[PDB]
Amino acid sequence: GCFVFKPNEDYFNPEDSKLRFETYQLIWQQMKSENERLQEELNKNLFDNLIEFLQKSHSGFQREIPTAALVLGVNVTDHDLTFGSLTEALQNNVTPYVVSLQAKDCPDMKHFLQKLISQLMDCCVDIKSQKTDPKMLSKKRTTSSQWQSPPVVVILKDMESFATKVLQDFIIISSQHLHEFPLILIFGIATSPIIIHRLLPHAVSSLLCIELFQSLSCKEHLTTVLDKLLLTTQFPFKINEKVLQVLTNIFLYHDFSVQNFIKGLQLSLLEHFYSQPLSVLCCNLPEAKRRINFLSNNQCENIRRLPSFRRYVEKQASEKQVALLTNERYLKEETQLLLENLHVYHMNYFLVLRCLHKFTSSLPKYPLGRQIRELYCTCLEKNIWDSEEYASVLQLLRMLAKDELMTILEKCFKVFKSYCENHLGSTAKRIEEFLAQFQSLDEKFEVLRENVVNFIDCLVREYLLPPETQPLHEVVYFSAAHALREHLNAAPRIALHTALNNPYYYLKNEANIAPDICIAYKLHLECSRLINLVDWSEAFATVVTAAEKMDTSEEMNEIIHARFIRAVSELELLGFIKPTKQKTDHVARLTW
Amino acid sequence: LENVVLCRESQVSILQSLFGERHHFSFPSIFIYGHTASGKTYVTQTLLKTLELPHVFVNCVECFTLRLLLEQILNKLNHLSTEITCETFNDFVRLFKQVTTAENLKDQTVYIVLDKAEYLRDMEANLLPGFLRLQELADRNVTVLFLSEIVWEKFRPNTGCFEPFVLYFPDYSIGNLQKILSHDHPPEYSADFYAAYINILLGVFYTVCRDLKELRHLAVLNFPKYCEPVVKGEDTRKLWRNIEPHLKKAMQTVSAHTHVELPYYSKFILIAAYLASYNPARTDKRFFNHLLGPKPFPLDRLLAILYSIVDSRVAPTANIFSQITSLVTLQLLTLVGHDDQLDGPKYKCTVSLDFIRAIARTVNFDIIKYLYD
Amino acid sequence: QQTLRNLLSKVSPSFSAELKQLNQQYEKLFHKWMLQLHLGFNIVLYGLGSKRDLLERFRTTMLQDSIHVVINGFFPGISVKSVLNSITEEVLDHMGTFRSILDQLDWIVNKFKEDSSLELFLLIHNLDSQMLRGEKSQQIIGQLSSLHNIYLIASIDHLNAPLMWDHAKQSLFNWLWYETTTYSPYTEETSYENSLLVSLPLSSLTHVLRSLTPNARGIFRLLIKYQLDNQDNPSYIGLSFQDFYQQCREAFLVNSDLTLRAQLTEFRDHKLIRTKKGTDGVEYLLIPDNGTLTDFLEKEEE
Amino acid sequence: SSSYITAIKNSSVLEQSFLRAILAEFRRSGLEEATFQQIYSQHVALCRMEGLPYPTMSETMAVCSHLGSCRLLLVEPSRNDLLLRVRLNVSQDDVLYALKDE
Amino acid sequence: TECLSQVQRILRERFCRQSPHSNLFGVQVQYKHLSELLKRTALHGESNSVLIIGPRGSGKTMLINHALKELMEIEESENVLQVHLNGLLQINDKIALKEITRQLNLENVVGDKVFGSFAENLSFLLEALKKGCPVIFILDEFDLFAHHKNQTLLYNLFDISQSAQTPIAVIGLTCRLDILELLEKRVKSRFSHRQIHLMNSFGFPQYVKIFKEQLSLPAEFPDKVFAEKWNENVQYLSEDRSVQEVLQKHFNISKNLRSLHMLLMLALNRVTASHPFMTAVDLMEASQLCSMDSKANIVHGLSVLEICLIIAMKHLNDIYEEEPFNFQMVYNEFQKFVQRKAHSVYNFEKPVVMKAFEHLQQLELIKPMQREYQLMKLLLDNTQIMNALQKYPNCPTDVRQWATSS
Ligand SMILES: Nc1ncnc2c1ncn2[C@@H]1O[C@H](COP(=O)(O)OP(=O)(O)OP(=O)(O)O)[C@@H](O)[C@H]1O
Ligand SMILES: Nc1ncnc2c1ncn2[C@@H]1O[C@H](COP(=O)(O)OP(=O)(O)OP(=O)(O)O)[C@@H](O)[C@H]1O
């Protein structure tokens, strides 16, 4: 019944579409490419150990077969990217004989060998420039007689979803003749190396050589990609703390994956670029200065009439208010410096935020934040010096004044001495201001008083709440929490509960008028233990008899029974009552 | 390749006698069972290598399909050309007559050696009784030489077949295990001293494994570790009493850490799944033998005890259900109604208690009196 | 069924204006879907009422230019073999391979990597059903829909509808989830499934399969094998009781005559074996088609 | 004529005692199903009673496949090996007449 | 000498290749029943289709080839075109059609069109033969042949045997008894009934004679003095009562006349090196090498950790009886025995004890019916374990006390 019709681009929909969409495409494509580069940099310490191990285990071949079981994380969402990077690295510094198996394209042995020799045939026929088992050995014998016989490796992606039978037969077949064909498999264990004992019995498990590797535990992966991706000054689009709070919570509670987080950031950027007509100038500062100067005047009335700017109108004098209200030529001039102040607030914000992160991560028990992520959270939910947590840091930091604090003042100063001229121009020259405080670190009271002036100037000067401190902040900030959360992580089991228990949409139905089906479910669960059929039909008949008389009985019984059975097919259909077979009839209360 | 026998001479001699010379007939089919340690391909390969009876050797582990099993037999046999293709069994019996008409092997009793025949047991019902009667099926002086891990009594087709001649290859003796576990090739010591080492190690170790391969591996590991304090410190009794403290731990040790970081709701999910697997004789009501294993239990009971465990800000979102699906792919939970439906089947717990104890303790929870007591 | 459905829609659904208005809220939501789907996302939308008419109005207003394989999933004909077959011929304008499902899967994957801007997107009513789901079944839809050039739109209906997706299965199609409510009764499902008050689809044979012993399941394996092996012989008038008794006794499924007779009369209750008296007076046995009998014990052994 | 009584009449001694063990366990249980170890114990008792040597179950299972090949009884697979449920293909009075006639 | 190699060559073929030795015993009346039937179906155009049933290892193929050879001796080569089929090779219809094409030398005419109705196919084979004529169909291993999807090459042969009247003998060779009851009712009702043979064995004091006539050097003369010496040695061994004892022991296990071939074949393998006339004790050990206890060789070779494990499983029958157990109860019983013991040699720790299980599964003494702590089944006897534990040579005293406690 899958009937097909044959038929026989820049459509976005004020906020005019073309440069808006190009702004979108540029920003998202930039973020995605730098996301992949910052992925591949972090695993270099991991797999450049692996190239050493595989080179050592190949080169001593003149009874054994080497396995390197990776312990990758629980996130199966991003396991493709690590294997692509590892395939690239092993293809470069070691052999151009690298294949990978997926454990869904091989239920049994014929599929295993056929897809393995097909991948090997294309992998060898590209870079030199069939169900049979020993012809693969003949392929190895023909294709590589030289280059000290580079070892073929296979990459099982999921160790777990493999059946044990086909895997056991493959390991015994490969271990039978590795005289020619030296094979070094690397299965990716999703959990932990305990389960390689579980899935492989001991004869096959005894046949091989296990050397496990760790992987990047995901919290200090997402601190890097959150810290480089949004906490920088570089990317023109920031995020609200509550929307970020939603995103990092559904990371840390449910998903434990990073690709989902980038999907959430992509959705947030997309919805922001749909949302408001001032979002077009989310750029760097001269690219902002380009067409602030020429723009439609109703969007400039929108730049007047957005509420943070009307707060700025509220705080200011009349003689420039009378020209800056309506006239575009001055409105450009003040909003240009407002956008410069936005960039200014970002630039002096984030570097001293990292400075405070280094100065707070050094502490025993770290009562403010565990890591660099939550420091963004604690300085935006409550006001930070209003809150008891920075009061606890300030109470902590007095009698911590020893050489650990001075030594880590020197060390934190060294890491933002690397960030001294990596910010390269500060918005108050705070680098050499604070460095002019921080240059007396080499030469026990001085740590205390220098601490006092440093955190007071630091936190009271810039480290503040970004909406109320800054007008025109809507252009960089996207905030809609439970609009987004239901798009990203929905709950139909709550939705049917809501629209079945209270189907009140806008005339009187809140606690009998306009269901048929919520009548059936509500009357089903007015007798809330279990049910049989005919008495339930009589009870529904009674309540819509009440509906009839609050506006012959046999025709009414017929139409009531017909709309009853139309209701009860749906009440079976939607995950409630499962049919109770072989009895006279009943229905079973399957959901409480 | 070197030593044919290493003192298993009588079975070797009766097999060698049973082959006979080339120009007369022999048995149709010979089945040799025994343990996996017992030399069952060492003895027959070093026996066949001596006389050079022109034979084909296969493994049934390698040939997972029937066609490859016939193809490599015919292809290896004709060398003693192209791939002489055989889709079916009757093609093999057909082409076998043309293959076994060469003057190397016209009168010679050809041996089709079949190794690890228990994997041939579930290949087909056709191929094993078709292979046992090959001496008169094709009538070309053949003898199909079986050897197996398994007993013949399970191996029969339950119709009857040509019952093969059955040998039992014997296990290795204790003093024979002194002799044949490398009394030849000690490199640098006396053979008395390496024999004294392995004589000490073996009588300790003759209760866990009599497999010669892994014992050769363990002896070649723990002998240079034994050998270093003689050549460095310098008297067999003292270093006997030194080598057995290393030997107990080397026995015991031939699994990095059990702890796995998880997302927090998944931790609470399999906490709830354990707690509703291991004491669940309607003891939902009280708080809010063990040895037989996990009892299966449906999903809504798990959701109820999940709500009782967690702080009550949980909602049944899509991610909590997708997470509870995704836990089963990692085989920490198992669906035991295999197809009972998409609606919530019994999900029984399949992780060990110490792992559960560590996952419970890494989020503030002591549960052992809460779990079964 | 039919005389029951004559009384359907006689007089008075008890609201109309807010129903038209609540459906009329969602017509503004369509250009967002078109843009969102152009970027590589996938829209599931769930609901309490019938939303496939909204999908039909949607593809009327915005899919006059593109290909769309409107895959219904409510009626019991469709499994994913029909999806791949119809997308092979009626989209790619030539037939494909025939050896296996994964062969045509990989082949129909392979056709789109080289042919840029072919711009095909199906949409599925009732992605969750008794027939459409399955780990063999759903992953073919996923692996198909993971590409840049294919944009599915679904509708799920069940309470346990997001239980058939692990994360790796979830990451094949970038889901985002819409909320809809229409309150319209699902007339196509309720039409073409069944009615209890009155051939047989897979649900009741699944229900009798899951409420009986596995030996009775092996018994109807034998009986359906003997039926399907002689389907185009017009002289095949069914096995007798004694032939079925000896061919069930040889496979150790049952011990006695009376046990097999009680099993036969309880399976004669469900109307899936009909007795036919020949000219001997001996009652032979034949069940009520052929193509719906290969599906079960195709899928009962994968 | 019926083949089965002539097959029992020309069966060997251990086969006849195996059938006697089968009917003895069928007299004890009353049923048509029996596992192999039960009739093996009955067969051990009868070979004890007749002055026969010990019925080793390699021989007893070889004789099981002997009688199962000839369809005097109906046999489970030999993989099950002790857990073979056997049913008797012939009626019991037939084999009682077949071992009773001499 | 000449004698030992010649006696080995001439006796080895009729022993273990089951070569056509001319003596046949116990089968004369069934053969004489077959012969005139074969002569009148062969010499005349009429077609009758006899059927033979016997047990495995006795009779059939020897009889039908002997009658075949004696009929082929009579000319007018008579142009009877025999065709040998087996039940094992030709499993399906398309294989069987091309096999009959192979046997009947048909491929001079190409015939390269698949016809729909296979009666027309078979009739075309018989038709192109008949224009080119008797055939004899030897349909070996009929019970596997009774498992076609559509029973074509059963039934169409019967239809042509009644209808084409080309000279035909459909001689079925079966092994199971119910060839009629297994046969489907249109064919079994159609033409299965031509007169059915039955085949069985005979008495033991003639079976000693068939031992003597089997073993004796034939009327073929390698060297007549050695023939006289050796068959007199055969009769001297035949009259000795220990040979009669082991032969009666072989009768009650085996009425087969194939087991005699193997039993004597091992004896003949031992003789030619020295004492070319052999002992009754040599026949006794030749019977002994034909093993009796297949599982005592398995259990007797096992190490003692598996021994106390398998008696722990035996003990798991003797409390809490008749469940398919798992690993944990086995572990508990083993720990309770080792805590009953004082010494700490045998308190081997938990991952070692898993290795004895997964080695013990490959011997299939334990059976699977979750992955490592489930539902394992034991298939064994007490008494062979009780005999094996006293036959364990380095059996320690603590597992002996476990055996006596039990
Ligand atoms: N008598 C012996 N002398 C020397 N080495 C031996 C002896 N018996 C076995 N081996 C060792 O065992 C290896 C052969 O193993 P074996 O012949 O036991 O395999 P197998 O019995 O076929 O194995 P399986 O039964 O598992 O198929 C040889 O490589 C050799 O190292
Ligand atoms: N009466 C007899 N005379 C001579 N030899 C006999 C006799 N009975 C049995 N044999 C021997 O027993 C064996 C019978 O083999 P044959 O193939 O003829 O029957 P079978 O083995 O029962 O048939 P199948 O191969 O179908 O089981 C042969 O060794 C044959 O020599």
Residue numbers in the entry:
A (entry chain C): 9 to 16, 27 to 31, 37 to 85, 98 to 164, 193 to 506, 548 to 615, 625 to 664, 669 to 709
B (entry chain E): 4 to 83, 91 to 244, 249 to 268, 295 to 328, 349 to 433
C (entry chain B): 269 to 466, 471 to 560, 562 to 575
D (entry chain A): 760 to 861
E (entry chain D): 14 to 89, 91 to 146, 152 to 388, 396 to 432
Could you share sentences copied from the article?
The origin recognition complex (ORC), composed of Orc1–6, is a highly conserved heterohexameric complex, which plays a critical role in recognizing origin DNA and promoting helicase loading. Each of the Orc1–5 subunits bears an AAA+ or AAA+-like domain and an α-helical winged-helix domain (WHD). Among Orc1–5, Orc1, Orc4, and Orc5 each contains a functional AAA+ domain for nucleotide binding; in contrast, Orc2 and Orc3 only contain a RecA-like subdomain with no predicted ATPase activities. Away from DNA, metazoan ORC resides in an autoinhibited conformation with a closed and constricted central channel to preclude DNA binding.
In contrast, in State II (~60% particles, 4.8 Å), ORC2-WHD is relocated to an equivalent position of DmORC. In State II, ORC2-WHD retreats from the inner surface of the ORC ring, generating a hollow channel. Thereupon, a new interface is formed between the HTH motif of ORC2-WHD and the β-hairpin motif of ORC1-WHD. The limited resolution at this region did not allow an independent assignment of the side chains contributing to this interface. However, the involved motifs are highly conserved among the metazoan ORCs, a comparative analysis of the interface could be deduced from the crystal structure of DmORC. In DmORC, the equivalent residue of HsORC2-Phe524, that is Orc2-Phe566, is inserted into another hydrophobic cavity formed by five residues (Leu905, Ile892, Glu894, Lys903 and Glu851) from the β-hairpin of DmOrc1-WHD. The neighboring Arg563 and Glu564 of DmOrc2 interact with Asn907 and Arg889 of DmOrc1, respectively. The interaction between ORC1-WHD and ORC2-WHD induces the transition from State I to State II, which is likely the first step of ORC activation for origin DNA binding.
